[PDB]
């Protein structure tokens, strides 16, 4: 467990993992600044790609061609994908109508990357066409509306549009939509009613909202809710808003939650709730996730000081 | 609405009034002092009249024969009948197991819980009886689950939510640890310290902020009221001391009084730093067609008592 300390005053949006390295994109900046991080050596390099923010980052392997691709979505609705070993080799797919706010990449076996954005609406790209200027997607999929974001995507596919969860499998197709703006068992209404922020996919449904300290858990079946974590009250065995900024799942029964202060909490998911608490591990966590075994934890304190711990 | 202050460093356990005055069960001594207070005079008296600390307090009422007792169940078990006119008058009920942590008046009936879980029923007429032995008792729980509250009746038993009507019969019997699954677990594994029943039965727990409603025939969890929500729109505990329905009053740890609707469970008005702790809130009848709502918290002590017409 070391902790990497970013450049003074670099904000990070969004953050993606590959002499380990990690790509980022900048929000510090209002146009499209894409950063390099070596985990070995703490090295930082950036480079602005693009007109508008980098709001969110996907890496495009192709294991035949033996080519990785990162691929950046703005705020302009740019899709912007450059070759990691020869920065030269870029382009672009086509715009989306709004702001990319999510990238994921799916596997079938094919593999596809999903592209949420803040219009409500989800492109699908298949693996091949990431390398085609001016690329369009296989399908387009109108979940929402321009008020409802689709922000989170899961893994069938799990996703947060809104106040709505919705799932979808190989032909693509909206099988299941579940409304979470409402449940009379609700500990409070007002945070219910708020942007999915985060999916988690376990045996149930654990979503996260927008400013709401209460962990929500549906059920894939029922659609309905299963049960209430209220990380305010965990923190509490006093002032802490409990806010949740992130959820990360372990192996298969801890799940990670960082909260809007810098507070971690490991619970577990089976038959009790309370594992491990760190207190003020740092001013507020913010990107917390897996990768290829290891943790990645990206938090900020404020003058700004972003930094990395990873264990 | 008036507030009268008590002497200095008086602690009030439990509180029943009658017509305007009102009985105390003092909870600042080790044993049973009974207080009397003049609501027009707001002159206080009192009196050790047992062993133990009064720990419950009911008023019945004869209206043959035209008697008023006043009924303290104490912490070793006690049950001292004492004249509303001559307090020369004063007589004791059958001793109970353990200590006496509920008194109801529901033909009319005195319904003793005990902390022992243990239910014992008296008639009207047999509160006048020196010794009197109950009609029934009813082992609800055990030593650990010591029966609390009562308001068909409804009581609180431990974790249990038990119901009964004509005396004989446990009807009802509901586990609410089960609610572990909603908002908190820690708080649902709590003894039942009050139960208002409406349309559902809105229950609060020791040291709890989460006010549970259930459902009379479903017998499973309708919501959640969680205070420490409520009162951020910082450091509040929230934890619920009393529940009292107009609407519903919830009176917490701290000095804040929280009003919400039911059919619509929305907030409709919040008093904050109305004291430092709010202990008791109750209904009482002061007279003919007088529906008035006491309020008794603290704040070196200081208890004080805050009185509103409905």
Redesign the interface.
């Known amino acids: 467990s070391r902790r990497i300390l970013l450049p003074k005053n670099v904000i990070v949006e969004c953050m993606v993992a590959t002499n380990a390295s990690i790509w980022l994109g900048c929000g510090h900046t209002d146009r499209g600044q894409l950063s390099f991080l070596d985990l070995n050596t703490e090295g930082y390099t950036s480079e602005e790609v693009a007109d508008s923010r980098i709001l969110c980052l996907a890496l495009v392997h192709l294991p035949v061609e033996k080519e990785s691709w990162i691929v950046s979505g703005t705020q302009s609705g740019t899709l912007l994908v450059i070759n990691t070993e020869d920065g030269k080799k870029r382009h672009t797919l086509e715009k989306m109508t709004d702001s990319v706010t999510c990238l994921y990449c799916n596997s079938f076996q094919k593999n596809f990357l999903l592209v949420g954005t803040a219009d409500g609406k989800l492109a699908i790209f298949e693996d091949k066409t990431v390398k085609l200027k001016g690329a369009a997607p296989l399908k387009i999929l109108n979940i929402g509306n321009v008020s409802t974001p689709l922000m989170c995507l899961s893994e069938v596919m799990w996703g947060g549009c809104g106040t709505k969860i919705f799932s979808f499998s190989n032909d693509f197709t909206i099988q299941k939509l579940i409304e979470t703006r409402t449940s ?8 219910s009613d708020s942007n999915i922020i985060t999916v988690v996919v376990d045996t149930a449904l654990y979503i996260a909202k927008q400013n709401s300290p209460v962990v929500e858990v549906w059920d894939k079946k029922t659609e309905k ?4 974590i ?1 990380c ?3 923190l509490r ?3 802490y808003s409990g806010r949740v900024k992130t959820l990360c799942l372990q192996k298969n029964t801890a799940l990670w939650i960082g909260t809007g202060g810098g507070h971690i909490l490991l619970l577990d998911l089976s038959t009790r ?1 309370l594992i491990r608490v760190i207190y003020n591990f740092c001013n507020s966590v913010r990107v917390m996730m897996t990768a290829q075994n290891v943790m990645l934890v990206l938090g900020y304190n404020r003058e700004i000081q972003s930094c990395l711990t990873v264990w």
């Open positions: 009379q068992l609700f500990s409070y209404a007002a945070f809710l299963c049960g209430l209220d305010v009250h965990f065995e006093m002032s709730r």
